Design a protein around this ligand. Structure first.
Ligand SMILES: *[C@H](O)[C@H](C[C@@H]1CCNC1=O)NC(=O)[C@H](CC(C)C)NC(=O)OCc1ccccc1
Ligand SMILES: *[C@H](O)[C@H](C[C@@H]1CCNC1=O)NC(=O)[C@H](CC(C)C)NC(=O)OCc1ccccc1
Lengths: 303, 303
């Protein structure tokens, strides 16, 4: 037993990270087949980033201006293109370590693993949720752009995130692997607002189920509620409204504990209105919402 | 910026995990050079585990009784030996993926990454601290034994932990890679007590420094303290006594924030005596102690 925030094993992605340098700017790229993907602001000087015209900037760059390095081994760039906010650098060698992979655009409330890299070398791996306001609470320093987020299903890597920027609030924003930003953000170093964030209700419920599956029961009570009655409370606490789809997704957990979903909603309601009284759930004194229902099943059954 | 619980990239270890089966018991082994390391209770039936005589049990096993499988590829076992609580299975093939590696015995209060595996296949990776009472707060199901804990320094993997057992309290115990248990534990499925756990004071201080480096400042105050005065408080709260060695290790953080270590101790003292008043530090409402000073430096400088 036990429950932890767990990242996917990163080996399949580690073999795809390379370094991309353009003039004095260096960040990471993702090498799949004969293409290297990287954020387009690699072509900016630290001064261009406050208001770049990426078209005019790219027009002064040729293939030999993109230095791509896999380990200590250099790659030869034979073409380049700009797709939305990423660059696609064509190289003359297919990555012999390319895994089976897909590009997917993840939905808010889903989770994924981030392999934080610098100079094309992995630094560490951690799990993130795509917030409802399309931000993530990451750990990113200068040079970390091009670090990617991913899920793994058996042997297939679904790439869903490439890192680009940190907002003034300390949260992090990026694109899918076709260069489209998650959320209302642009890759210009100017003040940008993510808007009100809300708690992922279905994930909090899954984590309360995970808590019961691991022996923390003090918050179960003799009450029940309705979808409509609970959502009047979710409103007051900037929680996502719960839906019947959410209820269905909690089915497997509702069946392994024997606790009806609306009964667990009744516990959550009391925790929202009364706090935790200095008690703790799975070693946390806050309500955690970065575990999907899928995440709890996977960990509580050894996938 | 940002601060997260981050595991090392797991690729170098993923290439060393194999499956080891003996009769009906299956767990994981670590394949390095021409040797596979695994917990010795792989030779037990589920009934033997409540009181095994490992010598008498091993005497009925030959090389061909140890089924070792790397992916879908079987390995040929040409010798076996029992060193303390692990088995060493000699195979006729050296792991072509063997990294540079060391076997180290970690100290209480240090951290390491766990690659949780089942059937020789990685499931996920997470960071753990070796508690002062020589337990860890992991995520382990049946079949996870043989999962290993490790650190990485550039290209060298320091293996420090192999998983064996879950105590009745829900915490997890294991050995170093020479088969010696961390703590007062034996590999028999009987009730065993880890004893009082205590909070890793030096790690809490490092995480408060990490909080300042990331903009959480509300807990800084106008007070200071002495090593002796603080440790009279640490006592009351089952905190590890702070030492001058601890003070030195916090030097780099004490120099990047400009906050004297005894001043930060004064903040911790007030947080212990007064709680957090429903406030939060790096998104947690508890005092976190599973980050070493080394861990904070590494993450706040991109190693
Ligand atoms: C790419 O490596 C980098 C990631 C930032 C740097 C610190 N933490 C991050 O997540 N991105 C940028 O430098 C980005 C470039 C634009 C053209 C999109 N601008 C940015 O993030 O500016 C805000 C900022 C910069 C430096 C420190 C903190 C915030
Ligand atoms: C090895 O795969 C396994 C790991 C346990 C199983 C559940 N969570 C863990 O960490 N170890 C054992 O089964 C171990 C065998 C002895 C000979 C050391 N006994 C054990 O951990 O028993 C306690 C226990 C068993 C099953 C569920 C929960 C606790």
């Amino acid at each position: 037993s036990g429950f932890r925030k767990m990242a996917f094993p990163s080996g399949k992605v580690e073999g795809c990270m390379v370094q991309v340098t353009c003039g004095t700017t260096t960040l990471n790229g993702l090498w799949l087949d004969d293409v290297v993907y990287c954020p387009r602001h690699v072509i900016c000087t630290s001064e261009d980033m406050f208001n770049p015209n990426y078209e005019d900037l790219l027009i002064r760059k040729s293939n030999h201006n993109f230095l791509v390095q896999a380990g200590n081994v250099q790659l030869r760039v034979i073409g380049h293109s700009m797709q939305n906010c990423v660059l696609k650098l064509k190289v003359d060698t297919a990555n012999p370590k390319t895994p089976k992979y897909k590009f997917v655009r993840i939905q808010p409330g889903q989770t994924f693993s981030v392999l934080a890299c610098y100079n094309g070398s992995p630094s560490g791996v951690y799990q993130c949720a795509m917030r409802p306001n399309f931000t993530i609470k990451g750990s990113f320093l200068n040079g970390s752009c091009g670090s990617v987020g991913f899920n793994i299903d058996y042997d297939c890597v679904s790439f869903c995130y490439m890192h680009h920027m940190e907002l003034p609030t300390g949260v992090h924003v990026g694109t899918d692997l076709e260069g489209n930003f998650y959320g209302p953000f642009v890759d210009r170093q100017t003040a940008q607002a993510a808007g009100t964030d809300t708690t992922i209700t279905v994930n909090v419920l899954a984590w309360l189920y995970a808590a019961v599956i691991n022996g923390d029961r003090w918050f179960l009570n003799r009450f029940t509620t309705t979808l409509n009655d609970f959502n009047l409370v979710a409103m007051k606490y900037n929680y996502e409204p719960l839906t019947q789809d959410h209820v269905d997704i909690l089915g497997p957990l509702s069946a392994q504990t024997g606790i009806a979903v609306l009964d667990m909603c009744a516990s959550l309601k009391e925790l929202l209105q009364n706090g935790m009284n200095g008690r703790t759930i799975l070693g946390s004194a806050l309500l955690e919402d970065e575990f999907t229902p899928f995440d709890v099943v996977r960990q509580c059954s050894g996938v």
